[PDB]
PDB file of C-alpha atoms and ligand atoms in Angstrom:
ATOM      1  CA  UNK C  13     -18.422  -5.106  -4.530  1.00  8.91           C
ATOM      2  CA  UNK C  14     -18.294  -2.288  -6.939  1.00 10.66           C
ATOM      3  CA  UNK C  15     -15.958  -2.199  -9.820  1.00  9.51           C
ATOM      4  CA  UNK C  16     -16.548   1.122 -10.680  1.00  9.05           C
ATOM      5  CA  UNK C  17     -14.212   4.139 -10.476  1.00 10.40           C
ATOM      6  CA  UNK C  18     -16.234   7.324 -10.203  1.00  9.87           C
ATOM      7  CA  UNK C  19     -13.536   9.759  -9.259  1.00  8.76           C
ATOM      8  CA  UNK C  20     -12.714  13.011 -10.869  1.00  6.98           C
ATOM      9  CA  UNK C  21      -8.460  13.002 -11.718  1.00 10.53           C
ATOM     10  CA  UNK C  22      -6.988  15.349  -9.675  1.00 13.20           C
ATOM     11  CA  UNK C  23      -3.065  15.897 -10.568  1.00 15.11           C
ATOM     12  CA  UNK C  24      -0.259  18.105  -9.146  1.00 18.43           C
ATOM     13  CA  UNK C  25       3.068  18.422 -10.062  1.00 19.91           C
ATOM     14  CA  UNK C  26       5.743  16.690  -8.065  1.00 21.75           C
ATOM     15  CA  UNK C  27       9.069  17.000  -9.043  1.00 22.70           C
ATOM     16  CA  UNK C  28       9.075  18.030 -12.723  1.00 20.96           C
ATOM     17  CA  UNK C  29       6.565  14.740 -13.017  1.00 22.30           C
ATOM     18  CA  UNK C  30       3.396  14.501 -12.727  1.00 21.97           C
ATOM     19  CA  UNK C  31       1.163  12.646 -10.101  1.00 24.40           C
ATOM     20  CA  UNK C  32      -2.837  11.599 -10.050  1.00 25.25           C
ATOM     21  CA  UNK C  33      -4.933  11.762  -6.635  1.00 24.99           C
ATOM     22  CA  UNK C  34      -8.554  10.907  -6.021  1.00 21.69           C
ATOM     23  CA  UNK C  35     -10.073  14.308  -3.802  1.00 23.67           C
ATOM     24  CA  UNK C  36     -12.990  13.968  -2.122  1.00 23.74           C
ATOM     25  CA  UNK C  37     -15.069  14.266   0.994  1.00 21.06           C
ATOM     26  CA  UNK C  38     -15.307  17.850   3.107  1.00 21.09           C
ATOM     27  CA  UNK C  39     -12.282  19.904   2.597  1.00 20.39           C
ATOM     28  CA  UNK C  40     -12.054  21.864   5.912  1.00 21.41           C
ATOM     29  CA  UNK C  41     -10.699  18.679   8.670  1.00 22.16           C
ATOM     30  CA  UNK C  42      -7.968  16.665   9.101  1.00 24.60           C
ATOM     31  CA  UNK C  43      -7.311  14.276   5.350  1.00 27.71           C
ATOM     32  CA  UNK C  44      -6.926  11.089   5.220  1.00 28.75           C
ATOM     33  CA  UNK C  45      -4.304   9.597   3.472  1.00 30.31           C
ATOM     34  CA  UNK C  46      -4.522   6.188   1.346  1.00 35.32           C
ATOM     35  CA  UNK C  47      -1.345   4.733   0.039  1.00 32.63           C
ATOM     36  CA  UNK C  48      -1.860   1.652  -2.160  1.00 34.84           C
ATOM     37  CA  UNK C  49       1.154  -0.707  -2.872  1.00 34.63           C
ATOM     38  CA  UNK C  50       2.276  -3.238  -5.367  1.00 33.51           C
ATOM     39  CA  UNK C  51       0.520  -3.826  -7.835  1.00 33.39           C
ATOM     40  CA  UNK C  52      -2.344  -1.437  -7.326  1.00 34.22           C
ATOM     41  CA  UNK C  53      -3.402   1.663  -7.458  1.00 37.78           C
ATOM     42  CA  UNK C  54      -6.474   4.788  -5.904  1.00 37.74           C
ATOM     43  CA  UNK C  55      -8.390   1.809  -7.237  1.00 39.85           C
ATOM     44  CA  UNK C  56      -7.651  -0.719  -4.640  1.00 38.78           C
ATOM     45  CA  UNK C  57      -9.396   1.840  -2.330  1.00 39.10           C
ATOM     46  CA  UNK C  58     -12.346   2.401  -4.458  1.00 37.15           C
ATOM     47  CA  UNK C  59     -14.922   0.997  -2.560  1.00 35.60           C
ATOM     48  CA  UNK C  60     -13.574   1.897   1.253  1.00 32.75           C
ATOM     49  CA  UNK C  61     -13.272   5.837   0.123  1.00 32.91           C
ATOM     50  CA  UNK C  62     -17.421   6.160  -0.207  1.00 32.24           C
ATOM     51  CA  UNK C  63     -17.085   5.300   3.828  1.00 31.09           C
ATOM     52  CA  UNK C  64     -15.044   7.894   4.532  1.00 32.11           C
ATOM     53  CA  UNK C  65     -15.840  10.457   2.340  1.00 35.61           C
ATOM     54  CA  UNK C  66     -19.090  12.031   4.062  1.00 35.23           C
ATOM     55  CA  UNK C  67     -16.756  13.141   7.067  1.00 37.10           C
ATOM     56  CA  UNK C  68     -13.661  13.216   6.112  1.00 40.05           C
ATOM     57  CA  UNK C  69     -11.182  14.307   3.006  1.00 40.73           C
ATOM     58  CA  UNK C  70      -9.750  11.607   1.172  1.00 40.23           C
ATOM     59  CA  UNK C  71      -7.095  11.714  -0.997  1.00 42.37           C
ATOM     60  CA  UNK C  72      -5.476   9.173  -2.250  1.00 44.66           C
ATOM     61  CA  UNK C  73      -2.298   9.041  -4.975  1.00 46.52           C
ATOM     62  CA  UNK C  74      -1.003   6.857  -7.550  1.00 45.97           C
ATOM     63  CA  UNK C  75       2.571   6.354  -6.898  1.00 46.58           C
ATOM     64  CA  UNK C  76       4.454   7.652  -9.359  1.00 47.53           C
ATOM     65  CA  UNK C  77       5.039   5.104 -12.369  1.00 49.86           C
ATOM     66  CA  UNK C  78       1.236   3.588 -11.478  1.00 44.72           C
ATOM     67  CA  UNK C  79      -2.018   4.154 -12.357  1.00 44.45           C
ATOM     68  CA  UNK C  80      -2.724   7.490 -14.026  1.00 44.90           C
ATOM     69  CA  UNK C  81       0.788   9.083 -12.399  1.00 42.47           C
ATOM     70  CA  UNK C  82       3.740   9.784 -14.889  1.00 45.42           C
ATOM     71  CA  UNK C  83       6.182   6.968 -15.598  1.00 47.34           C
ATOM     72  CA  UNK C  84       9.815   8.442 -16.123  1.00 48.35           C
ATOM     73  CA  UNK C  85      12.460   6.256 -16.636  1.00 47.40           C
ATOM     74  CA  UNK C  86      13.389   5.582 -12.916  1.00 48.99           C
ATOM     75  CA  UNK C  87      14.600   2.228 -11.510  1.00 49.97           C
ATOM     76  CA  UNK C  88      11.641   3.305  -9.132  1.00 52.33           C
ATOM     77  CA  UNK C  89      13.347   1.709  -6.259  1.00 54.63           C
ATOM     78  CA  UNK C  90      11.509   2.568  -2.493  1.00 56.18           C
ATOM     79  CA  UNK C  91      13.778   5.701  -2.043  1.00 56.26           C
ATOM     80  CA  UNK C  92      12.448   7.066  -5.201  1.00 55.76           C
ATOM     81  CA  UNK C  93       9.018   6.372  -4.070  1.00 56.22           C
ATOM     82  CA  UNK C  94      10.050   7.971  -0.734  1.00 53.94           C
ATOM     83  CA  UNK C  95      11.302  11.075  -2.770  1.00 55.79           C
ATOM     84  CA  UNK C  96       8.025  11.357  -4.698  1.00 57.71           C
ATOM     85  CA  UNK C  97       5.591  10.759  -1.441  1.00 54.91           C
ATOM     86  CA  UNK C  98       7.389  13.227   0.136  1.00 54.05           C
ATOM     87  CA  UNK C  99       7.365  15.721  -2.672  1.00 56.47           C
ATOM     88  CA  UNK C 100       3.515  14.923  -3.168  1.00 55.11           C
ATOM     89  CA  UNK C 101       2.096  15.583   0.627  1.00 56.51           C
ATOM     90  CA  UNK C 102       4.165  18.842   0.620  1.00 55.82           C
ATOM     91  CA  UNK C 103       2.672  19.820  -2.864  1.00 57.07           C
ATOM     92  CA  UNK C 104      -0.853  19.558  -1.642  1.00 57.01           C
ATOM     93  CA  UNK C 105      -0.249  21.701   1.423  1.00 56.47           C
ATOM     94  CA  UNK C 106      -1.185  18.824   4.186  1.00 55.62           C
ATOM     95  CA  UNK C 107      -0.770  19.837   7.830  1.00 57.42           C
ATOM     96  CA  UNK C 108      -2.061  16.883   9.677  1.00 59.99           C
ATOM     97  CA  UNK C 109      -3.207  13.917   8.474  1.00 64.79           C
ATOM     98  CA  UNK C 110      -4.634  10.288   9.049  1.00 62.94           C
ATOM     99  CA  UNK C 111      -2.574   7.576   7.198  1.00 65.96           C
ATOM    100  CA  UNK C 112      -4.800   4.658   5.381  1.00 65.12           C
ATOM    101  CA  UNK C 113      -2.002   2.298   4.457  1.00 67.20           C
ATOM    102  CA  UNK C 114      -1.542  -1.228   2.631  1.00 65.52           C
ATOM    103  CA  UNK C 115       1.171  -3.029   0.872  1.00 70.00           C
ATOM    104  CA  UNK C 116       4.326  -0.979   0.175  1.00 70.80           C
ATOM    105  CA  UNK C 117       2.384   2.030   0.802  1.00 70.84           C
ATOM    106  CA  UNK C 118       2.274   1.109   4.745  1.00 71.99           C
ATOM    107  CA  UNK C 119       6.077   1.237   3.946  1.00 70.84           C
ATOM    108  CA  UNK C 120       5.523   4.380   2.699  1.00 70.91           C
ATOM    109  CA  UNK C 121       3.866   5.412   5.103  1.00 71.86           C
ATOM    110  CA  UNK C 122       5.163   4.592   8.268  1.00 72.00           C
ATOM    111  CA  UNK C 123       8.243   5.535   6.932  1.00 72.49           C
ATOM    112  CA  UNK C 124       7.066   9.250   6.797  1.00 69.40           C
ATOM    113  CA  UNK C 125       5.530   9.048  10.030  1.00 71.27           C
ATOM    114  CA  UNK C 126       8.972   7.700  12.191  1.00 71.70           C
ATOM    115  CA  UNK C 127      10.043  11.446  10.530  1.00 72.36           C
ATOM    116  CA  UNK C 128       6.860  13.816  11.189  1.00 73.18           C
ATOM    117  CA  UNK C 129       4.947  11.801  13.769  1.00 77.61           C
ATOM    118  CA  UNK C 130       4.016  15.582  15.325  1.00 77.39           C
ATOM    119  CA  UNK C 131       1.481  15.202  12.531  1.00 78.00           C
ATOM    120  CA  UNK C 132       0.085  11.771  12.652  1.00 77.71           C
ATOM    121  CA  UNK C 133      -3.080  11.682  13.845  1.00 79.47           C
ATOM    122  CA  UNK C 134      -3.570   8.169  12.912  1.00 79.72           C
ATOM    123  CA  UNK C 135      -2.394   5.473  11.109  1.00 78.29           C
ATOM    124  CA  UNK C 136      -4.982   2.285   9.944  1.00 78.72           C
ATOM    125  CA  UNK C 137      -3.075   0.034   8.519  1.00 79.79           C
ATOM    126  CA  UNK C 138      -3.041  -3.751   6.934  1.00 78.13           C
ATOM    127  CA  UNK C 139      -0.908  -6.275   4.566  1.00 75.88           C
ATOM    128  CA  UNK C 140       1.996  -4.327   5.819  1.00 75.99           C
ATOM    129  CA  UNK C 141       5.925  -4.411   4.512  1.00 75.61           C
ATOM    130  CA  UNK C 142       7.697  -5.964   8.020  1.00 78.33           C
ATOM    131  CA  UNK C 143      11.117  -7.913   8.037  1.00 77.04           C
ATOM    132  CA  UNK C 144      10.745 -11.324   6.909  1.00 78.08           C
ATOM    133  CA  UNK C 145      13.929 -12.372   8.968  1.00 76.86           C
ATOM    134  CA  UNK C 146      13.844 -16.041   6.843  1.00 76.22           C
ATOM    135  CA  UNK C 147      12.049 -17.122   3.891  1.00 75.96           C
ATOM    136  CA  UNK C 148      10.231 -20.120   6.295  1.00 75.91           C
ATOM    137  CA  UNK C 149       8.397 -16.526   7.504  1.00 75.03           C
ATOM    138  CA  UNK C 150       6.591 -16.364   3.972  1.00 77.14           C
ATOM    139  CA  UNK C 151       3.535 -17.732   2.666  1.00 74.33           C
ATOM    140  CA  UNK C 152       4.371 -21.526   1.215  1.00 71.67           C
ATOM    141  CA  UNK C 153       2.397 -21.160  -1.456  1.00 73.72           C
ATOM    142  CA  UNK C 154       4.075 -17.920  -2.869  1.00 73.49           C
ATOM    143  CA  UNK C 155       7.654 -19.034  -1.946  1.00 74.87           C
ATOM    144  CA  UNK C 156       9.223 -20.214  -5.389  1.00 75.43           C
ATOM    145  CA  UNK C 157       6.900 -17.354  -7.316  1.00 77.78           C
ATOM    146  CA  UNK C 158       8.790 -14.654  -5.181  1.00 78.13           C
ATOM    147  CA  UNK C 159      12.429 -16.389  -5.165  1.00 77.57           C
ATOM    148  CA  UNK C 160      12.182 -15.952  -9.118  1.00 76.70           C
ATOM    149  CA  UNK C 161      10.609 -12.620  -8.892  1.00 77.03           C
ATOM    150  CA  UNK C 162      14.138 -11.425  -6.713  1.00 76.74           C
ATOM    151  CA  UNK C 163      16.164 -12.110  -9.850  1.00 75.84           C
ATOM    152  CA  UNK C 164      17.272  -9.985 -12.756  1.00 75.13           C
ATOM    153  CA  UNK C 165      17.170 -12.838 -15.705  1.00 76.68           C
ATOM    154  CA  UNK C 166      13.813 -14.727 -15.058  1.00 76.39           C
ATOM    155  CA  UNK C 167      11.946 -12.195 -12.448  1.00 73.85           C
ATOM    156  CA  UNK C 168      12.296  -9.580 -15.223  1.00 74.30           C
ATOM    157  CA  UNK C 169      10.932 -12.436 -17.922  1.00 76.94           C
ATOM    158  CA  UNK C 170       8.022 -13.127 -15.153  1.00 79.60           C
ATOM    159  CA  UNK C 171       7.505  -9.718 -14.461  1.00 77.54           C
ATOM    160  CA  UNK C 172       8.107  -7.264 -17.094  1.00 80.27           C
ATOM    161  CA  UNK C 173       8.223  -9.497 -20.451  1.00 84.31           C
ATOM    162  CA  UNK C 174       4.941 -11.687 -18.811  1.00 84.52           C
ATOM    163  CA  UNK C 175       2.765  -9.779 -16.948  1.00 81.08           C
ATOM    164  CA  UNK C 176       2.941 -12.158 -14.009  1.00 85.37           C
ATOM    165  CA  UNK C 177       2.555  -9.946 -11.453  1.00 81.67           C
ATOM    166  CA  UNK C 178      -0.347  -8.728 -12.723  1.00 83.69           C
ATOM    167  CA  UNK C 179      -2.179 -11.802 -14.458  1.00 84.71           C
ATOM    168  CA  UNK C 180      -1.093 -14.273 -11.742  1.00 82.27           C
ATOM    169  CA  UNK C 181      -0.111 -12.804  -8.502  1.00 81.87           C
ATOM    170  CA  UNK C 182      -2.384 -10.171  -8.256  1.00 82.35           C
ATOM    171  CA  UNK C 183      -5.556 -12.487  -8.824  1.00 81.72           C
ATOM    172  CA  UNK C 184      -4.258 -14.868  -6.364  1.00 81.13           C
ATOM    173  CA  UNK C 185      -3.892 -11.884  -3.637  1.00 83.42           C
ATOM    174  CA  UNK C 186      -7.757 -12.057  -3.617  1.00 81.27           C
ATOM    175  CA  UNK C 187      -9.695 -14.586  -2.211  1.00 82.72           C
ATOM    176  CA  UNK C 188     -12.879 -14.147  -4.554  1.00 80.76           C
ATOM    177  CA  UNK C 189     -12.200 -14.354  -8.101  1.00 81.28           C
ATOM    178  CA  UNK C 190     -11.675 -10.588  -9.861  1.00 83.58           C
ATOM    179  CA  UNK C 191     -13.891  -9.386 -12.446  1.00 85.76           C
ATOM    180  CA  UNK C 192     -12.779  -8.801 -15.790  1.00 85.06           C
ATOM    181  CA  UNK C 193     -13.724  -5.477 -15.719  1.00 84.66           C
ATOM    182  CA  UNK C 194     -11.931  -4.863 -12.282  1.00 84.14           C
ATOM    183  CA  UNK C 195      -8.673  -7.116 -14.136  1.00 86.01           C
ATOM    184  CA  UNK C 196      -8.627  -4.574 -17.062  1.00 83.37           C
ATOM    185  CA  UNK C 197      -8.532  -1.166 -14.403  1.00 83.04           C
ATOM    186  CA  UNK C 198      -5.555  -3.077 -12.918  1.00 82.40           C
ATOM    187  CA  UNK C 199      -3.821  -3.788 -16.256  1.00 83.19           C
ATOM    188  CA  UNK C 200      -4.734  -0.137 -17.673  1.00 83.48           C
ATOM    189  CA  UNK C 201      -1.649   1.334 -16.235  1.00 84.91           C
ATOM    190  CA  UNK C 202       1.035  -1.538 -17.633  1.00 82.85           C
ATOM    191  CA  UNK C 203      -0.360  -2.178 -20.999  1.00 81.89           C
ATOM    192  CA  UNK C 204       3.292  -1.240 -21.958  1.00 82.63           C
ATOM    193  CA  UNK C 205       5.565  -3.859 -21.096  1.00 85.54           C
ATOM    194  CA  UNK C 206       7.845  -1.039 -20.854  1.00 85.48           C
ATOM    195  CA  UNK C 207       6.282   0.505 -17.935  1.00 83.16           C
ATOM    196  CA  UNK C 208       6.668  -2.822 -15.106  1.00 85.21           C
ATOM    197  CA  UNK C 209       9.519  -1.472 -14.323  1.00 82.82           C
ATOM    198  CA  UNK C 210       7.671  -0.862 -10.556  1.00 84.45           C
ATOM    199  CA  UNK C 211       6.297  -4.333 -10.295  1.00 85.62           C
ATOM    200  CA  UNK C 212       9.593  -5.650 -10.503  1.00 86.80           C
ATOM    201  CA  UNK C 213      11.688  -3.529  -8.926  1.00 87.89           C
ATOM    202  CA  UNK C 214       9.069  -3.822  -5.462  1.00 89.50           C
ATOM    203  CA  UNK C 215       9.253  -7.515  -5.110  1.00 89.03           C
ATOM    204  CA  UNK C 216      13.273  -7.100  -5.455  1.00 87.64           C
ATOM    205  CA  UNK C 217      13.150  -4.447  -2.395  1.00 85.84           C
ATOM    206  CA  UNK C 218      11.116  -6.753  -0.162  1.00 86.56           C
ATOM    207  CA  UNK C 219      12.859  -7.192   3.115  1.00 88.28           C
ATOM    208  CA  UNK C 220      13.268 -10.614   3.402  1.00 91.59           C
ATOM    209  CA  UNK C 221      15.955 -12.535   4.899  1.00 95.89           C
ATOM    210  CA  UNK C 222      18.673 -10.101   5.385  1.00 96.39           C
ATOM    211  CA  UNK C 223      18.880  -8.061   1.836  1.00 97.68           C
ATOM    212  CA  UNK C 224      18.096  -5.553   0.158  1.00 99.16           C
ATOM    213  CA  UNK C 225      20.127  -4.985   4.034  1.00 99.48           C
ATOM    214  CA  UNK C 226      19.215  -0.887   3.043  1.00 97.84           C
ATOM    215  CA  UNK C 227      15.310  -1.633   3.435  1.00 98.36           C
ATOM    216  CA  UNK C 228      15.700  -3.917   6.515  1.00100.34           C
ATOM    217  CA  UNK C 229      17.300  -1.325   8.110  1.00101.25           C
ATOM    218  CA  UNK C 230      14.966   0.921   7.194  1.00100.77           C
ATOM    219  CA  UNK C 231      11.994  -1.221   7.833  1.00 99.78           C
ATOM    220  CA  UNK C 232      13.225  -2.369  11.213  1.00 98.85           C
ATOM    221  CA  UNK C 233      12.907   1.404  12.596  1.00 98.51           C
ATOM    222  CA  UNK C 234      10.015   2.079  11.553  1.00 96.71           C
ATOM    223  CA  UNK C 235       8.760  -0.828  13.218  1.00 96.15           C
ATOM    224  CA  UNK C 236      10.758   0.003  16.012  1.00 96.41           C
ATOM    225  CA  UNK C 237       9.371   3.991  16.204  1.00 92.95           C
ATOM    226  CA  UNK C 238       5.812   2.583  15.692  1.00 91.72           C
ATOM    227  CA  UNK C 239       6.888   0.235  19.113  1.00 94.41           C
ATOM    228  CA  UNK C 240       7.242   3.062  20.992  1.00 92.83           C
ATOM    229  CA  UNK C 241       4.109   5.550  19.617  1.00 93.84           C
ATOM    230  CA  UNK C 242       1.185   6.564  20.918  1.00 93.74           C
ATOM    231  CA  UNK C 243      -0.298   7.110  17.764  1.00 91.71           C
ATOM    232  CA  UNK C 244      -3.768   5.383  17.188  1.00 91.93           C
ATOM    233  CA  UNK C 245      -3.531   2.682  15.347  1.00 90.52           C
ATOM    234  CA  UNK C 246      -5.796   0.328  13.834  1.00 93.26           C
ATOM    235  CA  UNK C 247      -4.820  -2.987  11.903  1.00 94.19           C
ATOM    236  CA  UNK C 248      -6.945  -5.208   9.267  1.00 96.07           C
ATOM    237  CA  UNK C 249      -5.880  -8.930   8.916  1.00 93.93           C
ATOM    238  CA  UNK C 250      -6.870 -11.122   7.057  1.00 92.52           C
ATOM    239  CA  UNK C 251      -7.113 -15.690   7.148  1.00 95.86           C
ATOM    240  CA  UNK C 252      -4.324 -16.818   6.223  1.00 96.21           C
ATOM    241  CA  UNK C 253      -3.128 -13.363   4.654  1.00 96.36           C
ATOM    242  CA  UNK C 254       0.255 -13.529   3.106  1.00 93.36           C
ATOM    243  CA  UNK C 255       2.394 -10.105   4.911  1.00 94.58           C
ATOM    244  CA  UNK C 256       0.585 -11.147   8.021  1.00 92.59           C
ATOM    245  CA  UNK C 257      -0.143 -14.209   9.112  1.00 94.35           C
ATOM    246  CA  UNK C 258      -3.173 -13.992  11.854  1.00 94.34           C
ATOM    247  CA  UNK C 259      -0.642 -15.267  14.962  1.00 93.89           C
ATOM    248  CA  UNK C 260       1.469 -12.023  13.509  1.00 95.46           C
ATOM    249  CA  UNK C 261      -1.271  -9.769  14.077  1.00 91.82           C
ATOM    250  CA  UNK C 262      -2.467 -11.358  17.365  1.00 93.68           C
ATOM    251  CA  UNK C 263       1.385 -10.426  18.169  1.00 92.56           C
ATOM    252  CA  UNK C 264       1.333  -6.998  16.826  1.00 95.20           C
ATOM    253  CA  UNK C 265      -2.228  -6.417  18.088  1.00 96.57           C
ATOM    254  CA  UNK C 266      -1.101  -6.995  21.431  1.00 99.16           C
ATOM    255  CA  UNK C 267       2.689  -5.826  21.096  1.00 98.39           C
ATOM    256  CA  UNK C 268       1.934  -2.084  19.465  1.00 94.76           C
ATOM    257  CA  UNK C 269       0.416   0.617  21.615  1.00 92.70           C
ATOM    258  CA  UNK C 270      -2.982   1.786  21.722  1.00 94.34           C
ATOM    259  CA  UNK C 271      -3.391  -0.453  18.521  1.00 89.75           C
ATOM    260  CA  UNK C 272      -7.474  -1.792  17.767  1.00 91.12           C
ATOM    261  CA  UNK C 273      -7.374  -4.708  15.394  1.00 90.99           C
ATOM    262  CA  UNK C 274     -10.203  -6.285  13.235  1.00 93.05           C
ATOM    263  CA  UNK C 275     -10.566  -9.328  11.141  1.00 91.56           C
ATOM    264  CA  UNK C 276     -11.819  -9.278   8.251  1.00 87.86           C
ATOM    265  CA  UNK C 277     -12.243 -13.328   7.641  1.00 86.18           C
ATOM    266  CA  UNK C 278     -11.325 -15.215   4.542  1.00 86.41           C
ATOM    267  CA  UNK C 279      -8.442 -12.484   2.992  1.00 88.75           C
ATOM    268  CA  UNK C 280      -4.602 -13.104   1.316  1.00 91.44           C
ATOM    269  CA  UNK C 281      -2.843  -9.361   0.375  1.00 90.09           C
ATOM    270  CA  UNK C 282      -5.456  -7.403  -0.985  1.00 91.68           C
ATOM    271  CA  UNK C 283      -7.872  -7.501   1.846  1.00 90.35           C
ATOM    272  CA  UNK C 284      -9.651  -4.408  -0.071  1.00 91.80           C
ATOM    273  CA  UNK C 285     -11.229  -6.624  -2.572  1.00 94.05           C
ATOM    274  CA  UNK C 286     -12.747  -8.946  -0.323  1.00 97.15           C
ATOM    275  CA  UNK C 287     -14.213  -7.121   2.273  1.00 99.28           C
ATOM    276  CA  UNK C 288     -14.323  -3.304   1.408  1.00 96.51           C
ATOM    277  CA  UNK C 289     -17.711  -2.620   3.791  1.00 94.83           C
ATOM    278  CA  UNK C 290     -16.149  -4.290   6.740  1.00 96.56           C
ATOM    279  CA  UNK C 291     -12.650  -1.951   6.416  1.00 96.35           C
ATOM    280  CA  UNK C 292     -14.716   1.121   5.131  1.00 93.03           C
ATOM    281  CA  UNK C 293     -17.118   0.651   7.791  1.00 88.26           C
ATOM    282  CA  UNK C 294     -14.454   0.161  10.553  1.00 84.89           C
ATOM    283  CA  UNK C 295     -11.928   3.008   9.139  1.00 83.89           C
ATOM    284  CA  UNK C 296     -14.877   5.559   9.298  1.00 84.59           C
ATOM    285  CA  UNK C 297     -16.402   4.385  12.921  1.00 82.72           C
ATOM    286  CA  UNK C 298     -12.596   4.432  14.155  1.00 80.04           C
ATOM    287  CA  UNK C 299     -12.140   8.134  12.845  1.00 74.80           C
ATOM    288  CA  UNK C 300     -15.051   9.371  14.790  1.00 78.70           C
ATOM    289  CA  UNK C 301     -13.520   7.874  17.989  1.00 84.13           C
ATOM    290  CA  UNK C 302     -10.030   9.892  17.819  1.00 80.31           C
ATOM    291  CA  UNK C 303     -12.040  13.043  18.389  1.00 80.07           C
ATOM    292  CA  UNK C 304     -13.141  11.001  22.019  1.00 80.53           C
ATOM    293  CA  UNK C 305     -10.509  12.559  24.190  1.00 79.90           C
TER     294      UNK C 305
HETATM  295 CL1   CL G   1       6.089  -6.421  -3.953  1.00 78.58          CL
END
């Protein structure tokens, strides 16, 4: 598992800010999109791009206020996120596209596809943001963690003034240990306790049980759009995983049309770091078989 990033910056104003992308792979088909989430960046894909690459263009953005994008003093809440995706895909001139999604990115992401699904060709998907209708719906073992996280005096101490997110529950999203070198490319961007602002702010805008009500809403029809597309689809899981629990995706698997599903054995959140072959392998092979009409 390479912990290398050997990608070029690419960057393109968005919004009097400015954003980074990783660009590679032919330039003349249909692009695939990858959207990391919380609290990654184009490096959580690192190692599934080199799959994709010989066939297809790949691009793939740090959210604004994450890795080598601009941090302005936002509250960076989803609908600024929203505003800045938006702004980006437009920017780069993107027609058609294939959506590679994880994390708050799938929010991201399916969230721009319930509003131009005329040009989704695709969507892969895994550790997705879905309504967590009660907190017995979340992972035990993460339960207390992300009931301090969703509050303003000690989830800011955790998460800003600490590092938490980043020393504690990112390393326990992975189910081999991290390297220290691959530790250090996810601290790079948050060095300044200042700049957290994200990693807290995500956590708060998690829809579980009920509130932030504006994301639940906005969650539940996305869900509810992907329900009733025809979209391809294709959805990672991982044992137990922590977003989706494997009976969720058995559900979803079944429940979501024309929707191919693959495990990819022992995996929490970050299912990229522990088997990046297996979802590289399986996003490229899958891509080959939307062209079979
Ligand atoms: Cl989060």
């Amino acid at each position: 598992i390479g912990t290398g990033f050997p990608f070029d910056p690419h960057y393109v104003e968005v919004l009097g800010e400015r954003m980074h992308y990783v660009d590679v792979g032919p330039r003349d088909g249909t692009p695939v999109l990858f959207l990391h989430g919380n609290p990654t960046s184009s490096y959580v894909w690192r190692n599934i791009i080199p799959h994709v690459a010989p066939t297809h263009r790949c691009i793939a953005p740090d959210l604004i206020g994450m890795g080598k994008s601009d941090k302005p003093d936002l509250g960076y809440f989803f609908d600024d996120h929203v505003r800045f995706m938006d702004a980006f895909i437009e920017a780069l001139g993107l027609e058609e596209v294939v959506l590679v999604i994880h994390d708050w990115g799938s929010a991201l992401g399916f969230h721009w596809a319930k509003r131009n699904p005329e040009r989704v060709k695709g969507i892969a998907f895994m550790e997705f943001i879905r309504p967590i209708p009660t907190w017995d719906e979340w992972p035990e073992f993460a339960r207390e963690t992300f009931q301090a996280f969703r509050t303003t005096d000690v989830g800011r101490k955790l998460i800003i003034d600490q590092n938490v997110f980043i020393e504690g529950t990112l390393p326990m999203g992975v189910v081999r240990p991290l390297t220290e070198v691959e530790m250090d490319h996810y601290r790079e961007p948050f060095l300044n306790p200042v700049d957290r602002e994200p990693l807290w702010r995500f956590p708060n805008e998690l829809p579980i049980a009920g509130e932030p009500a504006n994301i639940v809403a906005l969650v539940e029809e996305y869900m509810d759009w992907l329900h009733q597309s025809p979209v391809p689809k294709l959805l990672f899981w991982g044992t137990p995983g922590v977003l989706i629990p494997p009976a969720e995706a058995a559900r979803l698997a079944k429940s979501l049309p024309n929707c191919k599903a693959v495990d990819i054995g022992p995996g929490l959140n970050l299912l990229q770091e522990d088997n990046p072959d297996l979802i590289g392998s399986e996003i490229a092979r899958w891509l080959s078989t939307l062209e079979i009409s």
